[PDB]
Write a protein that binds this DNA or RNA. Sequence first.
DNA 1: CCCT
DNA 2: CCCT
Lengths: 218, 218
Amino acid sequence: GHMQTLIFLDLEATGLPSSRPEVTELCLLAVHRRALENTSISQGHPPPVPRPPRVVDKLSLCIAPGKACSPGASEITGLSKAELEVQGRQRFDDNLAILLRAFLQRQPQPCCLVAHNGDRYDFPLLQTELARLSTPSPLDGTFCVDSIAALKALEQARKSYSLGSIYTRLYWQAPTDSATAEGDVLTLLSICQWKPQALLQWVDEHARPFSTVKPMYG
Amino acid sequence: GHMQTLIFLDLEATGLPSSRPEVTELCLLAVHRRALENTSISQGHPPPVPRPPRVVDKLSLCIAPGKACSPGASEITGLSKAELEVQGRQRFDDNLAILLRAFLQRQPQPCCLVAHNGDRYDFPLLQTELARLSTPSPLDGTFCVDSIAALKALEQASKSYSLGSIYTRLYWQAPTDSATAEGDVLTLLSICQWKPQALLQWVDEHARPFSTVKPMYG
DNA sequence: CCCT
DNA sequence: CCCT
């Protein structure tokens, strides 16, 4: 009934939902409630990009997909199944689920996941990948929330609500290292640090369990 | 008999070995053999700072120590037991050992740890922290190597061997984000990317099992 | 002599 | 219309 740790999440995959994609890279960035509360309210025209908090748990992993990547997805991310296999990256396996659960348990509960276009992409895909695994879902007790829905509410308080479009609106800069699991998570964090205590309170009242998120396929 | 994944490691602690320290933060950065082999040989006067490889697994975690930090250690790292406790960071517990083991198992074996002044600080301390845990050591099958010994051999080939002193010698820049588990690991990676295929071959011939590393105390 |  |  109150979120103690916001886990900023983003995945890079082989393609769009219509292509039945598989995760090629993921990145989680755990940050405590009071880490965000202790952050500068973005003032000035333009305001500076807020510094990430000091105490922050992070996990960036590369994953070998079972199928090839599309030319458009390969170019922007700069990844391919051939390259991931040659560097010995393992599949989305049961070992990965253990690694997530161990990482999650360190974070003070209740934790809420945060992903841009998460309710329509990052969560259903992650749920579908966890559906393949014989082990139970490690994100069972955790909550989730789409940052697009959050920023729409905050900013109305008349168009593109993309990750890159929001970041450039707020701070008037190009995102650093686009098309990388970590780079997009860091960009998402910066957006959420715009009005953090306002964002936190919205997440509390609109956060839902990850188990309620229906999968992409299967 | 041949290292497939170099895991760049560094810890931030409550103090020097003489003070019997405890880990306040750690960061692992796994990179495949071929990732380093596919890297620019640093040419030009001065040479540019090499780009980190694309496919790279990373894990940065904050840990609550059982004892207070020294004023000198607190200032440089910008951390304290009071702040770590208030943000709900757990102790160096059995859960952490599982998280390391799960992370390690993803990396193609045999993997070798790399830490600056590791044989005298980062490895013995990590061994002492793992000695407290009731579970077995997750770094059992892994190897290790001190980057100081590596760079001494490479640089004498064709005085101060600190992490900051080496980085400034090679590229003529100040390290980005000093006194942070991740920032020091990224600095170490850059140093090792100076002559990577030469560094790799030295690590092979001087890499030893982590279990041979005697602990700092206990 | 180097890590914190 | 947004994620890759």
